[PDB]
């Protein structure tokens, strides 16, 4: 129900997930620029809506969520429910395991 109770994460599995469901709109490497969505480099611990050069929705700026395992796990279940008014078009990742694997990868990849 929460990150706390979620399955352990496997970054290899998480990579598959990222590639198929997020890569279209997000970069992760420093210097890579933006896509439909902002570059996620250095995501962990940062305030939402603050990456330079990307035009965020007012909601994504106003929420000012500090991204971490906790917040990401809730967010990913249903982004539009988490930040009503966001322009990210993504239904959500329903399974606890899928979220845990994706987060494990992001931790490594966005570093």
Give the footprint of ligand HEC on this chain (CB under 6 A). 21-22, 24-26, 36-38, 48-49, 51, 56-57, 59-60, 67, 76, 86-90, 93, 102
Residue 48 CB, shortest distance to ligand HEC, in Å, is 3
Of 36 and 70, nearer to ligand HEC (C-beta) is 36
Of 10 and 51, nearer to ligand HEC (C-beta) is 51
Q: Which residues are annotated as a binding site for heme c?
A: 22, 25-26, 88
Q: Which residues are annotated as a binding site?
A: 22, 25-26, 88
Residue 7 CB, shortest distance to ligand HEC, in Å, is 17
- Closest CA relative to residue 41, chosen from 29, 52, 51: 29
- Tell me the β-bridge partners of 66: 47
Distance CA 29, CA 65 (A): 21
Residue 87 CB, shortest distance to ligand HEC, in Å, is 4
Residue identified by tokens 């993504």 is 90
Residue 15 CB, shortest distance to ligand HEC, in Å, is 12
- Closest CA relative to residue 65, chosen from 29, 91, 55, 56: 56
User: At a CB cut-off of 8 Å and minimum separation 6, what does 33 contact?
Assistant: 27, 39
The H or E element that residue 21 is part of is helix 11-21
């Amino acid at each position: 129900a929460s990150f706390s109770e979620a399955p352990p994460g496997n970054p290899k599995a998480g990579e598959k997930i990222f590639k198929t469901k997020c890569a279209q709109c997000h970069t992760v490497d420093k210097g890579a620029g933006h896509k439909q969505g902002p570059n996620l480099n250095g995501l962990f611990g940062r305030q939402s809506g603050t990456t330079p050069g990307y035009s965020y929705s007012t909601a994504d700026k106003n929420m000012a969520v500090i991204w971490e395992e906790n917040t990401l796990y809730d967010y990913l279940l249903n982004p539009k429910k988490y930040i009503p008014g966001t322009k990210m078009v993504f239904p959500g990742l329903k399974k606890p395991q899928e979220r845990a694997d994706l987060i494990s990868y992001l931790k490594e990849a966005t570093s």
